[PDB]
Design a protein around this ligand. Structure first.
Ligand SMILES: CO[C@@H]1O[C@@H](C)[C@@H](O)[C@@H](O)[C@@H]1O
Ligand SMILES: CO[C@@H]1O[C@@H](C)[C@@H](O)[C@@H](O)[C@@H]1O
Ligand SMILES: CO[C@@H]1O[C@@H](C)[C@@H](O)[C@@H](O)[C@@H]1O
Ligand SMILES: CO[C@@H]1O[C@@H](C)[C@@H](O)[C@@H](O)[C@@H]1O
Ligand SMILES: CO[C@@H]1O[C@@H](C)[C@@H](O)[C@@H](O)[C@@H]1O
Ligand SMILES: CO[C@@H]1O[C@@H](C)[C@@H](O)[C@@H](O)[C@@H]1O
Lengths: 90, 90, 90
């Protein structure tokens, strides 16, 4: 019985983000080339996946957090985390 | 407890695909910048992972669906989901 | 019971790596345009995630292997797999 992780990265430094689901909550550890630190992402979830893409130099991250049959999308677009439009019928 | 997801994205629109393993089957939700919709992917599996790459504007997706110790690779190369050559001796 | 996988890919051949957690071990299957073959990676873990990035033509891979509350990072930077600096307090 283990924590569950999801990871994404970008650029050539690189930056890395690792999300960990643990006892119903998801937190984030970050690397920007100069040591690991705790990130701002903090949301409910028993399961996590992540994807990200660059528009020029700007990173955009989408985290999919699931509890039961409900998946919530969280969005990073250079400012804060916001709730995304994702829905599903589970 | 919960469904298990995998996500991939491409381009700068972006396009996003989210695969959800729910009670033994994997389904797909799709974003191409204009609203979420249900994709054609539907395959059995308790666990899912995904990767994708672009060739110019053409997306290629590989979904790894697992039940027990058998992982089946499903391929999108523009022309419907086809069974891939992946094997593993788990 | 059912194994858990994580997948990454790079280039446009492409190269693909699929990591499978089974019976407390994470193993690796590899594709680079010929056949699937078993990779060198083999480490303890009940859960796995992965990310990778190119610097020029050189691939760098990070595998996050979790057992219980402990996530260990394994790093490929062209010459072998080495333990990474990642830490967390789960
Ligand atoms: C500067 O903010 C850091 O990087 C962003 C890309 C996000 O991962 C955020 O949660 C983190 O704290
Ligand atoms: C612009 O809309 C935001 O970004 C898209 C890429 C999707 O993640 C969508 O659900 C989200 O609300
Ligand atoms: C175009 O429609 C959507 O995009 C393809 C790339 C696949 O994800 C397919 O299953 C889905 O229906
Ligand atoms: C051409 O072969 C197809 O694409 C490769 C990139 C692999 O995913 C392989 O297993 C699949 O059958
Ligand atoms: C050349 O070595 C192969 O490719 C590397 C990028 C790693 O995936 C390694 O485990 C594998 O055996
Ligand atoms: C040089 O540092 C290595 O690469 C970084 C991108 C991180 O994965 C770090 O934990 C690892 O030790």
């Amino acid at each position: 019985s283990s924590v569950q992780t999801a990871a994404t990265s970008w650029g050539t430094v690189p930056s890395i983000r690792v999300y960990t689901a643990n006892n119903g909550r998801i937190t984030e550890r970050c690397w920007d080339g100069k040591g690991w630190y705790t990130g701002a992402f903090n949301e409910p979830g028993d399961n996590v996946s992540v994807t990200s893409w660059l528009v020029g130099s700007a990173i955009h991250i989408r985290v999919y957090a699931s509890t039961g049959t409900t998946t919530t999308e969280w969005c990073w677009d250079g400012n804060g985390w916001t709730r995304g439009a994702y829905t599903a019928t589970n």
